[PDB]
Design a protein around this nucleic acid. Sequence first.
DNA 1: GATGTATATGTCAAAGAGATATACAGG
DNA 2: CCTGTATATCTCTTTGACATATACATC
Lengths: 132, 132, 132, 132, 68, 68, 68, 68
Amino acid sequence: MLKFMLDTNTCIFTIKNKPEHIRERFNLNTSRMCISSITLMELIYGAEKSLAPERNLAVVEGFISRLEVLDYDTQAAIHTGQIRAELARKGTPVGPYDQMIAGHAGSRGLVVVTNNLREFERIPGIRIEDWC
Amino acid sequence: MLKFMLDTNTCIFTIKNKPEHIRERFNLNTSRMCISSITLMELIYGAEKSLAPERNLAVVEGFISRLEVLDYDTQAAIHTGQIRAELARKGTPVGPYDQMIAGHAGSRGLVVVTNNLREFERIPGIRIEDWC
Amino acid sequence: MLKFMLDTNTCIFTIKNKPEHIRERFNLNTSRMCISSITLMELIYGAEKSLAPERNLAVVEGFISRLEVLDYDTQAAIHTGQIRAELARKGTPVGPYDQMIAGHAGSRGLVVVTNNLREFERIPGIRIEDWC
Amino acid sequence: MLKFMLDTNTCIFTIKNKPEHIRERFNLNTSRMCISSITLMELIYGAEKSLAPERNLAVVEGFISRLEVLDYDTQAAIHTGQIRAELARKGTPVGPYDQMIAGHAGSRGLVVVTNNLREFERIPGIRIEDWC
Amino acid sequence: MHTTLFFSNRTQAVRLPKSISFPEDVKHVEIIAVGRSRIITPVGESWDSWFDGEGASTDFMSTREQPA
Amino acid sequence: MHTTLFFSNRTQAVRLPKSISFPEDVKHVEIIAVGRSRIITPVGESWDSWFDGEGASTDFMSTREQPA
Amino acid sequence: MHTTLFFSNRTQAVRLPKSISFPEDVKHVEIIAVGRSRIITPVGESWDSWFDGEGASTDFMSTREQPA
Amino acid sequence: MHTTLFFSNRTQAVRLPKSISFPEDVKHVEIIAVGRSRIITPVGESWDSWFDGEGASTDFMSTREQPA
DNA sequence: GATGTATATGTCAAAGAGATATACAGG
DNA sequence: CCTGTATATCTCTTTGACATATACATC
């Protein structure tokens, strides 16, 4: 029972702004959301290089504590490593973390929920949705 | 009891050259060797994009088979989001894939086995070995 | 280990016409390929309603024995019932067996190898390859 | 020790009506009742395509989690495709989901419990009941 | 409320506060996961929480649309 | 599933079967009473809490990238 | 992985651990020597054996009649 | 060749034909599941069957297209 | 002494893994 | 007869599930 996979962009936006049209779904789709451990590796980096690393760390650990964090595992790697070769066959480059996100979200049948709908366009056999 | 995370560079180098000094090493250290699932994706990418995707996915797949592929888990994403930030607090550059392998070994107490030593030194708290 | 999930239509064609290029592909990707038990149902049906069912029931056993036949489990259901709602919105459904073989592959990120491209391209989050 | 495998009409009815006798029966037969995944697909479809998808998926979750979701495996395939054929010999047609249920319940000697009994009787050698 | 989990030599168990402990006509029980929760019911009553709780929607699967 | 009831020196308890156990770290849970049953959940429950808990820093990840 | 050799009436034998044990009582497998190693596989391997085989099936599934 | 599988007291084994038996009486072996295959191997030589098998294509990974 | 907490050992059975035995082929 | 084909048994040790110990901890 798992349905959505927040892109790193989404988590940043939600951490920074704490919107009200964000709080919308989180309450509805609680116990269906999660993030790739990759997205966690980005968040920790950003808190750690920030001027308030213990406040910014402290908000994150609350953020991900209310999600589930899925481990980048062997199926997620194979899948990324296939779709990464497709993007090469057709010249479309995507950043290395967001395709690892892509190759994870794909391997399990989840909808990556991002706000960068304009280059989450192309990654073969993806299922985006735009909570912003 | 695992000790050795082979990097992507060693993997690739062994796949291409199947050297003899590696082959005795691989035989002694059989039940202590792994790779990060980050590496596996690269191996997989490299075969699919190659001029023989079926031939090279098999060679990988027997190479994979004889060791353990560790999932890039949370402890791995916390430890690389910390190794990645203080890396910027000192201005030394290492690849987004190379940070993750260094960090993942770092998160579990394993020594990275690489042949790009010079690029792994500047990584805080790391252990390093060369098997080529 | 798996990548390709063989659609019914593709299997039917390979049974009736037993081509040569397919044999080549088949021999490259042995142990990469699979079918849904949805399909295995549909084959057994045809053999049984045919003339000389002993003849064909025989030939399929050799077919499916040389494949992997993947069970239509929880995640495969869930992912299929989702894709089944999205095409309800679009007003464009697909055949009910085709909707299941889709989401099965889709719940594990496999690529559907079919030959009715035009009907399967409208399935959300699909990857397609065509061998006929 | 599973003995019952409820039909989609059975499950739909229980959800919309939550009658009382049906709750006593549910409570007495617990761990002796299951559903085919094929009915799980129809159940999350109905929830998704509803005008309350997250509320409805949260009733469906409380429902599957108290009983069992038997996989529609390969032994269940043959049974469906056999009785799918012999119904063609006899010219009486039956729904695909209702016929893929039926072929699951028999393959594991189980009681179909439904409320469209006149629909199901045409199915050769299936043991049925009603609980509504 | 609030309580602890703990290990009794090899089994991970929760402690039951005295207020909401289980009555004397309840002496061993059933247990079921729904999401990150677990529900604990006495025997014969696992569906009682589900029947009493959240309902479906009114529109929910009026039709069914099985491809006739 | 089936599980058990038992006394830890005075406190009543239940043993979670291992298949539906909680992570070994997790020590604190929220017990609540529905009809004759109980529910158990880990403690970081509400998405209300986190929106009404704290705030990020002004500059936190005003940038994010590596080689796109 | 690790496993062990053993004699069953002067006949030598290997124990497949349950991790990588074979699904059915598929009773027949094809053994070979590679070097000082041994490779074991079920009997229905080669996809040519099925291509060089029976089943003209000329009437078989002129249609599939899925209920679209 | 062609051998059989069989169950002992809850353990799945293969019967090794006397021709291809393992030299020396001997101690323990390693095993790995590749595909639907099982390779068996004397301890300390698990990797041999892979070095002496087919090699990767010259084009395999000339480049390793990692970013920065 | 009601109420929680911790850990210290107990038995008990099933199961993966080993260890032998000793039946009956059927060329 | 000798491989094979089966069967039996017997050790172990692990581990999940079931029970009793109080160390005491405080308020």
